[PDB]
């Protein structure tokens, strides 16, 4: 049935979408905005301009077919960005060094319809299968599960491209557990994890969740589209009605768990005064041949009842206190948005022994009024 907290689907009087006047010129396309933003975001992070150009070339190659839609009077509200734009910029810090820059996109049809959009989203993967650095076999093996006869009205599939400092790009896909409806979501996930060779670990997680506050809504199944030992399967669990201590304890099922770290992050950012507008999410990672989740990353919502400026102040302060580059985070937010609540979540994984702390941001371009 779709995400209850972030709207997406056909634009109409019931789902209006209005361009902010002072952003891109009349006639500008989403791809125009994304290219400009991608460049400015690389610069704000001190990344090599050559790598930014490579990122732009890659985005045009893979998404240009669908992303050259007009910013003005869009026919579809996308899920990928909180303002409804069909692209979202993200920066990720894994310990020290230059941040990874990611863009996540949705491919819409002309005109945008559920069936058209699902066709486009899966046609994107066929195009991606021609790219030497992509491994699309594992996701195309799931197409019959996630691409039914009649998609639901709020269908989505999202595609990520990561630009890494001094390294080859990484590709990711995000799939909708609700593709065949809410009722079918558990069986769709069970079957997908079977096909991906991580059934035991998944069912182990299910059993664990049943005893630790419950498995809230599964928000997404994501795959790293690489043929490497680093590639993972990822499941995003949204935690309605759980307190911060319980979310922390729930993560103990995963390797690398650091008791107390999740609860502290939630207290420092989301706060304990007002429930957030949407619940936190834990992303559990899986690897074929490992019987438990290999990692857990917390997705932290911005605090309710507090201005966005304070949300950014808290998030930056939390970053600093983890030894990460908060200045880069603030610069990236400015570059990506051109005051406005355009963040999605902020992601955090504490450093396990021998490891590095991780923090990531996810920011809409602010093309549309909230």
Residue numbers in the entry: 2 to 339, 344 to 375
Publication passage describing the model:
Heterologous expression in Streptomyces lividans TK21 and an in vivo analysis revealed that TleC catalyses the ‘reverse' prenylation of the cyclic dipeptide (−)-indolactam V (1) at the C-7 position of the indole ring with geranyl pyrophosphate (GPP) (C10) to produce lyngbyatoxin A (2), with the C19R configuration, as in the case of LtxC15. MpnD also catalyses the ‘reverse' prenylation of 1 at the C-7 position, with DMAPP (C5) to yield pendolmycin (3). The overall structures of TleC and MpnD adopt the ABBA-fold, which consists of ten antiparallel β-strands assembled into a circular β-barrel, surrounded by a ring of solvent-exposed α-helices, as observed in the structures of indole PTs and aromatic PTs222324252627. In contrast to typical indole PTs that exhibit broad substrate specificities towards the prenyl acceptors but with strict specificities towards the prenyl donors, it is remarkable that the indolactam-specific TleC and MpnD exhibited unusually relaxed substrate specificities towards the prenyl donors and accepted different chain lengths (from C5 to C25) of prenyl pyrophosphate in vitro.
